[PDB]
């Protein structure tokens, strides 16, 4: 009972599931394509807590995998390298055939730890995690993904750290060096943060010993 998209004589129209349309000429299977779209194009925030809060763990329900031939380039993508509080891997390893999406600009890894009760991390609004051209309903460990939907129609690594990943009370950091971190805030975009990381690193005004120095961005 899945609807398809079809092009009208003018603009785009909803193709029916039940009605036979006389103008809907289908001469080949090459006219039916699976296209992936990124939800960032619908205004979904790409901040770290904004995306992680949209994901969560649940038990019982099995994963599903779907196939694309084409899709949108993503500006912002994520991975996860999250372990349970005692190090016991929150996500299952991506199975054979699951690879990250073709291309993006800013890819985040959000490594870290947190409570992860459940069998899988599912998207809360039901968006798909887009891997390669094989999107799925769950997040797989170590493999990057885009956040998106399936239409059915006729760079750089940031590697933020995470604490308390699978719960509501969390912390996230941008790593400049092994001893140097910056606290994240949603008002600061990847461009800001990366310009900031180059300034800190290049100026050298950061920890240079063995101890951690963690910076907060001034309120202004």
């Amino acid at each position: 009972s899945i609807p398809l998209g079809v092009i009208h004589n003018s603009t785009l129209q909803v193709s029916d599931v039940d009605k036979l349309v006389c103008r809907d000429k289908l001469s080949s299977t090459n006219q039916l394509r699976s296209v992936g779209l990124n939800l960032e194009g619908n205004g979904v925030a790409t901040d770290v807590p904004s995306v992680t809060k949209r994901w969560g763990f649940r038990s019982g329900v099995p994963p599903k995998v779907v196939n694309y031939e084409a899709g949108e380039w993503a500006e912002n993508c994520y991975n996860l390298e999250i372990k349970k509080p005692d190090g016991s891997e929150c996500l299952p390893a991506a199975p054979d055939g699951i690879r990250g999406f073709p291309r993006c600009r800013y890819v985040h890894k959000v490594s870290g730890t947190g409570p992860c009760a459940g069998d899988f991390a599912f998207h809360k609004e039901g968006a798909f995690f887009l891997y390669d051209r094989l999107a799925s309903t769950v997040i797989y460990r170590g493999t990057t993904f885009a956040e998106g939907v399936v239409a059915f129609l006729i760079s750089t690594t940031i590697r933020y750290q995470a604490t308390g990943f699978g719960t509501n009370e969390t912390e996230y950091l941008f790593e400049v060096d092994n001893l140097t971190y910056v606290q994240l805030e949603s008002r600061f975009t990847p461009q800001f943060l990366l310009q900031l990381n180059e300034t800190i690193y290049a100026s050298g005004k950061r920890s240079n010993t063995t101890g951690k120095l963690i910076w907060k961005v001034n309120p202004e």
Binding site: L196, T199, L213, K216, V217, N218, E220
Partner: peptide, 23 residues
């Protein structure tokens, strides 16, 4: 501390939250 050039600040752990430094 505050480093206006970076626009960042950092704190001693025992003064966390209670102390806010700006410029």
């Amino acid at each position: 501390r505050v480093v206006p050039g970076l626009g960042l600040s950092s704190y001693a752990q025992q003064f966390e939250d209670r102390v806010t430094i700006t410029a």
